Design an enzyme around this catalytic site. Structure first.
Site, PDB file in Angstrom:
ATOM      1  N   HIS A   1      80.022  13.890  19.445  1.00 50.99           N
ATOM      2  CA  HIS A   1      80.029  15.006  20.351  1.00 50.99           C
ATOM      3  C   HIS A   1      79.925  14.539  21.789  1.00 50.99           C
ATOM      4  O   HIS A   1      79.065  13.718  22.095  1.00 50.99           O
ATOM      5  CB  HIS A   1      78.815  15.841  20.020  1.00 50.99           C
ATOM      6  CG  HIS A   1      78.898  17.245  20.508  1.00 50.99           C
ATOM      7  ND1 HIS A   1      80.035  18.011  20.375  1.00 50.99           N
ATOM      8  CD2 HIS A   1      77.978  18.029  21.128  1.00 50.99           C
ATOM      9  CE1 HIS A   1      79.810  19.206  20.886  1.00 50.99           C
ATOM     10  NE2 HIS A   1      78.574  19.246  21.347  1.00 50.99           N
TER      11      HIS A   1
ATOM     12  N   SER B   1      80.668  21.086  25.497  1.00 45.65           N
ATOM     13  CA  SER B   1      79.884  21.881  24.570  1.00 45.65           C
ATOM     14  C   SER B   1      79.875  23.365  25.072  1.00 45.65           C
ATOM     15  O   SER B   1      80.895  23.978  25.156  1.00 45.65           O
ATOM     16  CB  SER B   1      78.484  21.195  24.373  1.00 45.65           C
ATOM     17  OG  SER B   1      77.538  21.813  23.499  1.00 45.65           O
TER      18      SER B   1
ATOM     19  N   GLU C   1      82.515  15.466  14.471  1.00 43.53           N
ATOM     20  CA  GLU C   1      82.081  16.679  15.103  1.00 43.53           C
ATOM     21  C   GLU C   1      82.059  17.915  14.183  1.00 43.53           C
ATOM     22  O   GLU C   1      83.090  18.379  13.664  1.00 43.53           O
ATOM     23  CB  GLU C   1      82.937  16.916  16.344  1.00 43.53           C
ATOM     24  CG  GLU C   1      82.709  15.875  17.395  1.00 43.53           C
ATOM     25  CD  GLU C   1      82.751  16.454  18.793  1.00 43.53           C
ATOM     26  OE1 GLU C   1      82.151  17.519  18.948  1.00 43.53           O
ATOM     27  OE2 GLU C   1      83.367  15.875  19.742  1.00 43.53           O
TER      28      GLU C   1
END
Lengths: 297, 297
Positions: B269, B145, B239
Site C-alpha cells: 500500500h 489512500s 493490496e
C-alpha cells in the site's frame, strides 16, 4: 489532416451495426472483411513477405531499417474470423513505428479448428521465432480482441512447456473471459457496435466446442498468471469487453505481473484499426510503439 | 546505492503488522505515525512554508527553481489520521521532481469531524487555489489512500458547484469503496500488512457514521464520474484495496474519463513512501512526475 469527432464516428458505427445482415454466413462474413479492410491504408514503406512460423503461415512486415526487434502478432475477430490481411492497417503501423519486424500469424480458426488449435499454432510459432530472433528478450507478443486473449494464453501454455518468457505482452481490447458475465457485458452492450455482444455467445461457442469456458487457456482471467512478462493493455470506453481488461489487470496484478492499462474516452472495440477517422487511434499506436521499443532492450 | 529485495521488505512489513498493539488509542496512533515519519528523508532543497488555502492549514512545498504548476495534495490515513508532516517524505519528492509548488492540505480528520468535513475542506482549498494559480490548467490533484478518495470526491463536488476542472488527477492506492466487498478485499487481505484490512471496517465507520457507505462523495466508485479530468492511478499487488484501483478504472473509463493505471509487482500500500527501502518507489515517483509535468502543456 482531417478527423471525425469520436462521437460522430460512434454514430457511423452505430449505423453500420444497425444495417448489418443478421445471419451472415461465416464464409461471407470473412470475405466481407477481406474486401473492406483492403481499402484501409497500409503504412508506407512496410514490406510484406508471405511466409511461416513453425509451419503456421504468417505475413512478415518491416521497413528497410528495422533493428533486431520482433513482434509476434495475433489479429482478432472472435476466433471465428479475421486473418493477417484484414489487420494490416494496424500491424503495418506497429511495424513501421517500432522499427521491428512484425510477424502476423494466421492461426487455425474455428469452427473448423476449435480450441486448442489456435493456441497450439501460437505456441508453435513463438517456438520458431526464438530460433530466428536468437533471444526471448527481443520479442514482444501482441494482439487485439481474440488475439489479445491468445497473447496471454499462448504464453501461459509456452511457460508450462518450459519456454523462456518474452520481453512483454501488448493487448488491444483483449477478449479473455468467455463467460461473458462481468459488469461491462450488461452495462455497456448498448454502446458496443463492433463486438457483437448479442451473439458473442455463439461466437465463442464455435471456438469453445466441448470445452469449459473457464478453461484457463480459453479465458486467461481464470488462469494462474504468475510468472508472465510485463503487460500493456489499451481498451476503449465503448466496449462490452471493458471488464475483460480491468479484470485481466486485476488478476494478473494480483499474480505479481507488471501491468499498465489505459482506457480511451469515446473509443470503440479495437479502435486502433481506425486511425483514418479518429486521432486517438494513432496516439494509442504511437504509445504502444514507444513502450515496445523502450523495453525490447 | 542500497535497496531491499521487494519480497524482503514485505517480510519486514509483515513483522510490524504481527507485533503492533491490538487497540492503540487513536491519539497515540496519530502521535506515533508522526514520530516514526519524522525519520524518513525529505527532498533536499524543498522549502517548507506553513500556510493556508481558503482557511485550511497547509504545508506549501517547493524548490527555489519551481515553475508555475501547482499540485494540491491530500494525504492518506483512513480519513482518521495522517497529516502534511507524515507525508513529507512522499510530497517533497513530488515537488522536487515535478518543478511544482505542492500544497499539502491539512484537511479535517474524523472522528472529530466526520463526512463531509474533509471534502468541504478539499473543495474550499481548490477554490482558493484557483485564484492563487490563476488558472485550473496548472493544477493537479494528488493523494494516497483516503487522499486518493478525496482527490476524486473533491472534484465531483467542485464539479457540482460549477468550478472548472484541473489539468489531472493523480491517485496512489486510492481508497474509494468504503463497502470493502470487492475481490482483492478478501483475496489479498493476508498479503496486506499496511492497509490493515481487519480494522479498516470499523476504522472507516468513524468517517461514515450514520451516512450511507455508497454515497458517491464517500465511495466514488458508486458516482456518476462523467466529466472528471484525466486520471493516473498507481497501486501495488499486495493490496486489499487493489480492486478499488481496477474498479475505479472500470467505472471512470466507462463514464468517459481518461484513465491510466499501473499496478506494481510486490509493492505494498502506497509504496511510494518507501524509496529509502524499495527501488520501485523512486521509479513510480519518477513516472508520476513525468505525467504531471507533461499535462502542464
Amino acid at each position: 489532416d482531417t478527423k471525425m469527432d469520436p462521437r460522430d464516428f460512434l454514430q457511423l458505427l452505430k449505423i453500420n451495426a444497425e444495417k448489418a445482415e443478421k445471419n451472415l454466413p461465416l464464409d461471407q462474413k470473412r470475405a466481407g472483411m477481406e474486401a473492406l479492410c483492403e481499402r484501409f491504408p497500409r503504412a508506407e514503406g512496410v514490406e510484406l513477405t508471405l511466409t511461416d512460423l513453425g509451419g503456421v503461415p504468417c505475413i512478415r512486415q518491416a521497413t528497410d531499417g528495422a533493428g533486431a526487434a520482433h513482434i509476434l502478432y495475433f489479429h482478432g475477430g472472435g476466433y471465428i474470423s479475421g486473418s493477417p490481411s484484414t489487420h494490416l492497417v494496424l500491424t503495418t503501423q506497429l511495424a513501421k513505428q517500432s522499427s521491428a519486424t512484425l510477424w502476423s500469424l494466421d492461426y487455425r480458426l474455428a469452427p473448423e479448428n476449435p480450441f486448442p488449435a489456435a493456441v497450439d499454432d501460437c505456441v508453435a510459432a513463438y517456438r520458431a521465432l526464438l530460433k530466428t530472433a536468437g533471444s526471448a528478450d527481443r520479442i514482444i507478443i501482441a494482439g487485439d480482441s481474440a488475439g489479445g486473449g491468445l497473447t496471454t494464453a499462448s504464453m501461459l501454455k509456452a511457460k508450462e512447456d518450459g519456454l523462456p518468457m518474452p520481453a512483454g505482452l501488448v493487448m488491444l481490447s483483449p477478449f479473455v473471459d468467455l463467460t461473458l458475465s462481468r459488469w461491462s457485458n450488461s452495462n455497456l452492450a448498448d454502446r458496443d457496435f463492433l463486438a457483437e455482444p448479442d451473439t458473442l455467445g455463439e461466437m465463442s461457442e464455435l471456438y469453445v466446442g466441448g470445452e469449459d469456458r473457464k478453461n484457463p487457456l480459453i479465458s486467461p482471467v481464470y488462469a494462474d498468471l504468475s510468472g508472465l512478462p510485463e503487460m500493456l493493455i489499451h481498451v476503449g470506453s465503448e466496449e462490452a469487453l471493458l471488464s475483460d481488461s480491468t479484470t485481466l489487470a486485476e488478476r494478473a496484478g494480483a499474480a505479481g505481473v507488471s501491468v499498465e492499462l489505459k482506457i480511451w474516452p469515446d473509443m470503440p472495440h479495437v479502435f486502433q484499426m481506425y486511425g483514418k477517422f479518429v486521432n486517438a487511434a494513432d496516439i494509442s499506436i504511437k504509445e504502444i510503439c514507444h513502450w515496445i521499443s523502450a523495453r525490447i532492450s
